[PDB]
Amino acid sequence: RRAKKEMVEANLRLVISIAKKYTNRGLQFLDLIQEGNIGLMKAVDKFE
């Protein structure tokens, strides 16, 4: 519960970077960003 938050805070820039490809005028910035945080945190739960 502590240790992962480090990793989570780490790659925020990969998150936002990949997000801002499909920020064509499809939806909105931060919504893509939030769902990217989601997909991340689930990638975090599983990684080997």
Partner DNA sequence: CTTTTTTGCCTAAAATGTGATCTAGATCACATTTTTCGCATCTTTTTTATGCTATAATGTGTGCAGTCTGACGCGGCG
Chain residues in the site for DNA (CB under 7 A): 10-17, 20, 25, 46-48
Q: Which helix (H) or strand (E) holds 32?
A: helix 29-44
CB 4 within 8 A of CB 13: no
Cβ within 8 Å of residue 40, ≥6 positions away: 8, 11, 15
Q: Looking at beta carbons only, is 3 or 29 nearer to DNA?
A: 29
Q: Looking at beta carbons only, is 1 or 30 nearer to DNA?
A: 30
What is the smallest separation between the CB atom of 25 and DNA, expressed in angstroms? 6
What is the smallest separation between the CB atom of 5 and DNA, expressed in angstroms? 15
